[PDB]
């Protein structure tokens, strides 16, 4: 409901480092605060501000052109990714209480070893949730992150490393269906989604999602020409994979053309009129935004299946690691 | 039968022994992209990468793609800039413009006529000039500049070719923005001659200026402005943006610089400014005016709002 910007710390950093030019980058939900924050910086420091106006979907999406034009770029809403010279990551952790939703999920647990995952805006609250589940008699573990998702318990739409742990079931804390869906697909374990805003908890089963999707990607079985999508965004670029996929298509008597872009949208893909697309950019596009693409959009593994390169199986999660 | 663009592209690839080729197309030509890629990969040893971003003009080179390939072929626009490995395939129209020119002669009231057009028809202006002179007029074709390279060529952001000694203009092409721009920039009468429909009409900037007046009026009460800068290769005007911010403060207003690639209504809605000043493509300001959710002004209109320009002293926003 509210988010914590480290504003007094940002001002100190600017005044301490004597920055004269300061960049600001916000995910879409936080752009509503950009002008207010610019105002504070310009009124209380001698720096002048440039706000990034582009969509920003994550720490995978750094405005590197802006960073190369300022002394420091403050990037909000996301946990840091990569290692950039002058980019400072401002967490913006959420203050919503997750304990009621966790207790709500307790009566959906079957096993005794429970794992917890969440997104970055709640990772600071997992410790007290783990205490609650251990007080209810269960064992609880919070899996460690990797270089892409640094915080224990943190998952992304493209990274489920925190869910690779010695437990039997998971509780996902947060909103939406795609994160717990991905965890259930990645681990093949039971996942309860506990929404802290609604204080409701539901089992997220992947069988429906895998089954309907499998039947649909078989539409691409008959595709002859593929567009292989590559994004230039700072943390989504997979050109070497795209060139491997193009070679595998040719090996199997089909054709892929590499299409290089920044934003991946249906409007820009409709114009090319390939039979189907393979997405090497943000993998959440493939399973969410793709529902209203006019041609099939496949993960790299799904592409290999349609080609005959690998044997059929339900969709695995396309991870970036 | 002879594809002129494709044969030139293949010969260029063969001569320069390119192994990695980029293709960049504007919106209406992307439907040819895979077919051209297929020909290149079939008939040369090159691998092709297609730009998937929107492309609005030669002001909008995919420089990331250019730095990823041996040669980038950019379609639909006359060149601008000095990119070492970008080849411009102008994709010119072959329609006979002479019938529209003769139709425009009916509406002329002066003896000394200037000719302007877009890249589509620039190779046909010499013939049109010859026809206008043999029907009793004087005719001149103004020279362009480093941005609108061909004689008589105008862009939505460049009317240099219309700054020439004449009394009246014939614009050859479709759409009315360019001849309106010429009429406003020169204060001369402009006849617009559409060669596809073969018709000619006088353009009147009256409705256009009245519409711009409405956006100026709304922004007059704005306290906080977003000043838009684009990173596109030929649209970047950060120094202008910084000047406009200073003039805003001089006049008791506030402007914040916002740097972006694409300029869209959805992206401006996200920010809490009262109004915006656009230093990127000036056609954004006009074309999308009705879809923006706050007034979007040209730099000159911003000057009017702040009290630095007379409201009657409207000028076209040009990239020079
Ligand atoms: N290259 C790209 N082009 C267009 N949209 C993108 C994109 N990358 C991400 N997105 C958008 O951002 C959404 C993911 S954002 C929410 C996921 C979050 N980053 C996480 O991993 O936890 C996608 O559904 C898509 O709508
Ligand atoms: N940076 C940008 N972001 C979004 N749209 C842009 C843009 N630059 C140009 N456009 C789009 O492209 C349109 C101009 S297209 C016709 C202009 C042509 N290049 C000429 O000069 O003759 C604008 O109306 C706008 O809708
Ligand atoms: S799921 Fe997409 S938007 Fe989220 S971090 Fe991964 S690549 Fe970025
Ligand atoms: S009018 Fe806009 S799109 Fe056309 S050349 Fe000028 S800046 Fe580019």
PDB file of N, CA, C and O in Angstrom, chain B residues 262-306:
ATOM      1  N   UNK B 262      10.875   6.298 -27.061  1.00  0.00           N
ATOM      2  CA  UNK B 262       9.540   6.584 -27.578  1.00  0.00           C
ATOM      3  C   UNK B 262       8.820   7.586 -26.687  1.00  0.00           C
ATOM      4  O   UNK B 262       8.924   7.535 -25.459  1.00  0.00           O
ATOM      5  N   UNK B 263       8.049   8.476 -27.302  1.00  0.00           N
ATOM      6  CA  UNK B 263       7.234   9.452 -26.584  1.00  0.00           C
ATOM      7  C   UNK B 263       5.775   9.067 -26.822  1.00  0.00           C
ATOM      8  O   UNK B 263       5.275   9.192 -27.950  1.00  0.00           O
ATOM      9  N   UNK B 264       5.095   8.574 -25.796  1.00  0.00           N
ATOM     10  CA  UNK B 264       3.727   8.095 -25.941  1.00  0.00           C
ATOM     11  C   UNK B 264       2.807   8.677 -24.874  1.00  0.00           C
ATOM     12  O   UNK B 264       3.248   9.033 -23.775  1.00  0.00           O
ATOM     13  N   UNK B 265       1.502   8.733 -25.146  1.00  0.00           N
ATOM     14  CA  UNK B 265       0.578   9.212 -24.112  1.00  0.00           C
ATOM     15  C   UNK B 265       0.632   8.411 -22.821  1.00  0.00           C
ATOM     16  O   UNK B 265       0.523   8.988 -21.736  1.00  0.00           O
ATOM     17  N   UNK B 266       0.815   7.094 -22.910  1.00  0.00           N
ATOM     18  CA  UNK B 266       0.861   6.274 -21.706  1.00  0.00           C
ATOM     19  C   UNK B 266       2.066   6.629 -20.843  1.00  0.00           C
ATOM     20  O   UNK B 266       1.982   6.623 -19.613  1.00  0.00           O
ATOM     21  N   UNK B 267       3.196   6.940 -21.471  1.00  0.00           N
ATOM     22  CA  UNK B 267       4.376   7.278 -20.687  1.00  0.00           C
ATOM     23  C   UNK B 267       4.238   8.639 -20.021  1.00  0.00           C
ATOM     24  O   UNK B 267       4.701   8.822 -18.891  1.00  0.00           O
ATOM     25  N   UNK B 268       3.585   9.597 -20.670  1.00  0.00           N
ATOM     26  CA  UNK B 268       3.415  10.889 -20.007  1.00  0.00           C
ATOM     27  C   UNK B 268       2.357  10.841 -18.902  1.00  0.00           C
ATOM     28  O   UNK B 268       2.504  11.511 -17.871  1.00  0.00           O
ATOM     29  N   UNK B 269       1.306  10.037 -19.079  1.00  0.00           N
ATOM     30  CA  UNK B 269       0.303   9.894 -18.031  1.00  0.00           C
ATOM     31  C   UNK B 269       0.924   9.476 -16.703  1.00  0.00           C
ATOM     32  O   UNK B 269       0.437   9.867 -15.633  1.00  0.00           O
ATOM     33  N   UNK B 270       2.004   8.690 -16.755  1.00  0.00           N
ATOM     34  CA  UNK B 270       2.599   8.131 -15.545  1.00  0.00           C
ATOM     35  C   UNK B 270       3.191   9.208 -14.652  1.00  0.00           C
ATOM     36  O   UNK B 270       3.325   9.006 -13.440  1.00  0.00           O
ATOM     37  N   UNK B 271       3.572  10.339 -15.229  1.00  0.00           N
ATOM     38  CA  UNK B 271       4.191  11.425 -14.477  1.00  0.00           C
ATOM     39  C   UNK B 271       3.162  12.486 -14.101  1.00  0.00           C
ATOM     40  O   UNK B 271       2.191  12.716 -14.821  1.00  0.00           O
ATOM     41  N   UNK B 272       3.377  13.144 -12.971  1.00  0.00           N
ATOM     42  CA  UNK B 272       2.347  14.066 -12.472  1.00  0.00           C
ATOM     43  C   UNK B 272       2.642  15.514 -12.838  1.00  0.00           C
ATOM     44  O   UNK B 272       2.634  16.402 -11.990  1.00  0.00           O
ATOM     45  N   UNK B 273       2.893  15.776 -14.117  1.00  0.00           N
ATOM     46  CA  UNK B 273       3.090  17.144 -14.567  1.00  0.00           C
ATOM     47  C   UNK B 273       1.758  17.732 -15.028  1.00  0.00           C
ATOM     48  O   UNK B 273       0.856  17.006 -15.450  1.00  0.00           O
ATOM     49  N   UNK B 274       1.647  19.052 -14.935  1.00  0.00           N
ATOM     50  CA  UNK B 274       0.473  19.755 -15.443  1.00  0.00           C
ATOM     51  C   UNK B 274       0.446  19.801 -16.970  1.00  0.00           C
ATOM     52  O   UNK B 274      -0.633  19.803 -17.568  1.00  0.00           O
ATOM     53  N   UNK B 275       1.611  19.856 -17.607  1.00  0.00           N
ATOM     54  CA  UNK B 275       1.726  20.017 -19.055  1.00  0.00           C
ATOM     55  C   UNK B 275       3.144  19.619 -19.438  1.00  0.00           C
ATOM     56  O   UNK B 275       4.003  19.409 -18.577  1.00  0.00           O
ATOM     57  N   UNK B 276       3.371  19.477 -20.736  1.00  0.00           N
ATOM     58  CA  UNK B 276       4.645  18.979 -21.245  1.00  0.00           C
ATOM     59  C   UNK B 276       5.135  19.857 -22.378  1.00  0.00           C
ATOM     60  O   UNK B 276       4.347  20.463 -23.103  1.00  0.00           O
ATOM     61  N   UNK B 277       6.455  19.923 -22.519  1.00  0.00           N
ATOM     62  CA  UNK B 277       7.092  20.604 -23.634  1.00  0.00           C
ATOM     63  C   UNK B 277       7.928  19.562 -24.343  1.00  0.00           C
ATOM     64  O   UNK B 277       8.794  18.936 -23.721  1.00  0.00           O
ATOM     65  N   UNK B 278       7.689  19.384 -25.645  1.00  0.00           N
ATOM     66  CA  UNK B 278       8.294  18.291 -26.402  1.00  0.00           C
ATOM     67  C   UNK B 278       9.481  18.805 -27.217  1.00  0.00           C
ATOM     68  O   UNK B 278       9.294  19.563 -28.178  1.00  0.00           O
ATOM     69  N   UNK B 279      10.704  18.352 -26.876  1.00  0.00           N
ATOM     70  CA  UNK B 279      11.866  18.675 -27.707  1.00  0.00           C
ATOM     71  C   UNK B 279      12.251  17.545 -28.663  1.00  0.00           C
ATOM     72  O   UNK B 279      13.278  17.666 -29.348  1.00  0.00           O
ATOM     73  N   UNK B 280      11.499  16.444 -28.681  1.00  0.00           N
ATOM     74  CA  UNK B 280      11.729  15.365 -29.654  1.00  0.00           C
ATOM     75  C   UNK B 280      11.024  15.704 -30.963  1.00  0.00           C
ATOM     76  O   UNK B 280      10.792  16.890 -31.242  1.00  0.00           O
ATOM     77  N   UNK B 281      10.642  14.693 -31.734  1.00  0.00           N
ATOM     78  CA  UNK B 281      10.015  14.906 -33.043  1.00  0.00           C
ATOM     79  C   UNK B 281       8.847  15.886 -32.928  1.00  0.00           C
ATOM     80  O   UNK B 281       7.913  15.643 -32.134  1.00  0.00           O
ATOM     81  N   UNK B 282       8.859  17.005 -33.664  1.00  0.00           N
ATOM     82  CA  UNK B 282       7.738  17.947 -33.530  1.00  0.00           C
ATOM     83  C   UNK B 282       6.423  17.425 -34.068  1.00  0.00           C
ATOM     84  O   UNK B 282       5.374  17.981 -33.708  1.00  0.00           O
ATOM     85  N   UNK B 283       6.409  16.408 -34.938  1.00  0.00           N
ATOM     86  CA  UNK B 283       5.128  15.849 -35.360  1.00  0.00           C
ATOM     87  C   UNK B 283       4.417  15.095 -34.239  1.00  0.00           C
ATOM     88  O   UNK B 283       3.183  14.968 -34.291  1.00  0.00           O
ATOM     89  N   UNK B 284       5.154  14.603 -33.229  1.00  0.00           N
ATOM     90  CA  UNK B 284       4.498  14.033 -32.047  1.00  0.00           C
ATOM     91  C   UNK B 284       3.510  15.044 -31.481  1.00  0.00           C
ATOM     92  O   UNK B 284       2.362  14.717 -31.135  1.00  0.00           O
ATOM     93  N   UNK B 285       3.959  16.298 -31.376  1.00  0.00           N
ATOM     94  CA  UNK B 285       3.167  17.342 -30.742  1.00  0.00           C
ATOM     95  C   UNK B 285       1.837  17.523 -31.450  1.00  0.00           C
ATOM     96  O   UNK B 285       0.792  17.678 -30.810  1.00  0.00           O
ATOM     97  N   UNK B 286       1.860  17.502 -32.780  1.00  0.00           N
ATOM     98  CA  UNK B 286       0.652  17.725 -33.563  1.00  0.00           C
ATOM     99  C   UNK B 286      -0.157  16.440 -33.701  1.00  0.00           C
ATOM    100  O   UNK B 286      -1.358  16.408 -33.399  1.00  0.00           O
ATOM    101  N   UNK B 287       0.485  15.358 -34.154  1.00  0.00           N
ATOM    102  CA  UNK B 287      -0.246  14.144 -34.509  1.00  0.00           C
ATOM    103  C   UNK B 287      -0.992  13.559 -33.317  1.00  0.00           C
ATOM    104  O   UNK B 287      -2.152  13.148 -33.441  1.00  0.00           O
ATOM    105  N   UNK B 288      -0.346  13.503 -32.154  1.00  0.00           N
ATOM    106  CA  UNK B 288      -0.934  12.824 -31.004  1.00  0.00           C
ATOM    107  C   UNK B 288      -1.603  13.775 -30.020  1.00  0.00           C
ATOM    108  O   UNK B 288      -1.996  13.350 -28.925  1.00  0.00           O
ATOM    109  N   UNK B 289      -1.786  15.042 -30.403  1.00  0.00           N
ATOM    110  CA  UNK B 289      -2.294  16.039 -29.464  1.00  0.00           C
ATOM    111  C   UNK B 289      -3.568  15.575 -28.772  1.00  0.00           C
ATOM    112  O   UNK B 289      -3.705  15.715 -27.546  1.00  0.00           O
ATOM    113  N   UNK B 290      -4.505  15.001 -29.533  1.00  0.00           N
ATOM    114  CA  UNK B 290      -5.800  14.664 -28.962  1.00  0.00           C
ATOM    115  C   UNK B 290      -5.727  13.491 -27.993  1.00  0.00           C
ATOM    116  O   UNK B 290      -6.601  13.356 -27.124  1.00  0.00           O
ATOM    117  N   UNK B 291      -4.707  12.648 -28.124  1.00  0.00           N
ATOM    118  CA  UNK B 291      -4.564  11.454 -27.307  1.00  0.00           C
ATOM    119  C   UNK B 291      -3.784  11.700 -26.026  1.00  0.00           C
ATOM    120  O   UNK B 291      -3.922  10.924 -25.074  1.00  0.00           O
ATOM    121  N   UNK B 292      -2.983  12.758 -25.969  1.00  0.00           N
ATOM    122  CA  UNK B 292      -2.295  13.089 -24.728  1.00  0.00           C
ATOM    123  C   UNK B 292      -3.295  13.526 -23.674  1.00  0.00           C
ATOM    124  O   UNK B 292      -4.310  14.151 -23.974  1.00  0.00           O
ATOM    125  N   UNK B 293      -2.972  13.215 -22.426  1.00  0.00           N
ATOM    126  CA  UNK B 293      -3.861  13.471 -21.312  1.00  0.00           C
ATOM    127  C   UNK B 293      -3.516  14.779 -20.583  1.00  0.00           C
ATOM    128  O   UNK B 293      -4.122  15.081 -19.551  1.00  0.00           O
ATOM    129  N   UNK B 294      -2.590  15.572 -21.128  1.00  0.00           N
ATOM    130  CA  UNK B 294      -2.285  16.937 -20.706  1.00  0.00           C
ATOM    131  C   UNK B 294      -1.748  17.670 -21.934  1.00  0.00           C
ATOM    132  O   UNK B 294      -1.388  17.023 -22.922  1.00  0.00           O
ATOM    133  N   UNK B 295      -1.731  19.006 -21.938  1.00  0.00           N
ATOM    134  CA  UNK B 295      -1.232  19.718 -23.120  1.00  0.00           C
ATOM    135  C   UNK B 295       0.233  19.400 -23.376  1.00  0.00           C
ATOM    136  O   UNK B 295       1.049  19.368 -22.455  1.00  0.00           O
ATOM    137  N   UNK B 296       0.566  19.200 -24.645  1.00  0.00           N
ATOM    138  CA  UNK B 296       1.953  19.029 -25.069  1.00  0.00           C
ATOM    139  C   UNK B 296       2.276  20.138 -26.056  1.00  0.00           C
ATOM    140  O   UNK B 296       1.601  20.277 -27.086  1.00  0.00           O
ATOM    141  N   UNK B 297       3.301  20.929 -25.731  1.00  0.00           N
ATOM    142  CA  UNK B 297       3.652  22.149 -26.438  1.00  0.00           C
ATOM    143  C   UNK B 297       4.961  21.963 -27.190  1.00  0.00           C
ATOM    144  O   UNK B 297       5.842  21.200 -26.764  1.00  0.00           O
ATOM    145  N   UNK B 298       5.090  22.684 -28.307  1.00  0.00           N
ATOM    146  CA  UNK B 298       6.391  22.855 -28.939  1.00  0.00           C
ATOM    147  C   UNK B 298       7.228  23.822 -28.100  1.00  0.00           C
ATOM    148  O   UNK B 298       6.701  24.541 -27.247  1.00  0.00           O
ATOM    149  N   UNK B 299       8.544  23.889 -28.345  1.00  0.00           N
ATOM    150  CA  UNK B 299       9.365  24.875 -27.621  1.00  0.00           C
ATOM    151  C   UNK B 299       8.904  26.309 -27.813  1.00  0.00           C
ATOM    152  O   UNK B 299       8.937  27.098 -26.862  1.00  0.00           O
ATOM    153  N   UNK B 300       8.498  26.668 -29.036  1.00  0.00           N
ATOM    154  CA  UNK B 300       8.020  28.029 -29.291  1.00  0.00           C
ATOM    155  C   UNK B 300       6.691  28.299 -28.587  1.00  0.00           C
ATOM    156  O   UNK B 300       6.442  29.426 -28.126  1.00  0.00           O
ATOM    157  N   UNK B 301       5.797  27.304 -28.540  1.00  0.00           N
ATOM    158  CA  UNK B 301       4.533  27.503 -27.819  1.00  0.00           C
ATOM    159  C   UNK B 301       4.778  27.652 -26.326  1.00  0.00           C
ATOM    160  O   UNK B 301       4.095  28.433 -25.645  1.00  0.00           O
ATOM    161  N   UNK B 302       5.745  26.902 -25.797  1.00  0.00           N
ATOM    162  CA  UNK B 302       6.136  27.077 -24.399  1.00  0.00           C
ATOM    163  C   UNK B 302       6.580  28.512 -24.134  1.00  0.00           C
ATOM    164  O   UNK B 302       6.182  29.117 -23.131  1.00  0.00           O
ATOM    165  N   UNK B 303       7.401  29.072 -25.030  1.00  0.00           N
ATOM    166  CA  UNK B 303       7.800  30.472 -24.911  1.00  0.00           C
ATOM    167  C   UNK B 303       6.585  31.390 -24.858  1.00  0.00           C
ATOM    168  O   UNK B 303       6.568  32.359 -24.090  1.00  0.00           O
ATOM    169  N   UNK B 304       5.552  31.095 -25.651  1.00  0.00           N
ATOM    170  CA  UNK B 304       4.336  31.903 -25.608  1.00  0.00           C
ATOM    171  C   UNK B 304       3.692  31.830 -24.228  1.00  0.00           C
ATOM    172  O   UNK B 304       3.299  32.858 -23.656  1.00  0.00           O
ATOM    173  N   UNK B 305       3.582  30.620 -23.670  1.00  0.00           N
ATOM    174  CA  UNK B 305       2.949  30.430 -22.362  1.00  0.00           C
ATOM    175  C   UNK B 305       3.721  31.182 -21.284  1.00  0.00           C
ATOM    176  O   UNK B 305       3.132  31.857 -20.425  1.00  0.00           O
ATOM    177  N   UNK B 306       5.046  31.132 -21.340  1.00  0.00           N
ATOM    178  CA  UNK B 306       5.870  31.777 -20.322  1.00  0.00           C
ATOM    179  C   UNK B 306       5.948  33.292 -20.480  1.00  0.00           C
ATOM    180  O   UNK B 306       6.413  33.965 -19.553  1.00  0.00           O
TER     181      UNK B 306
END
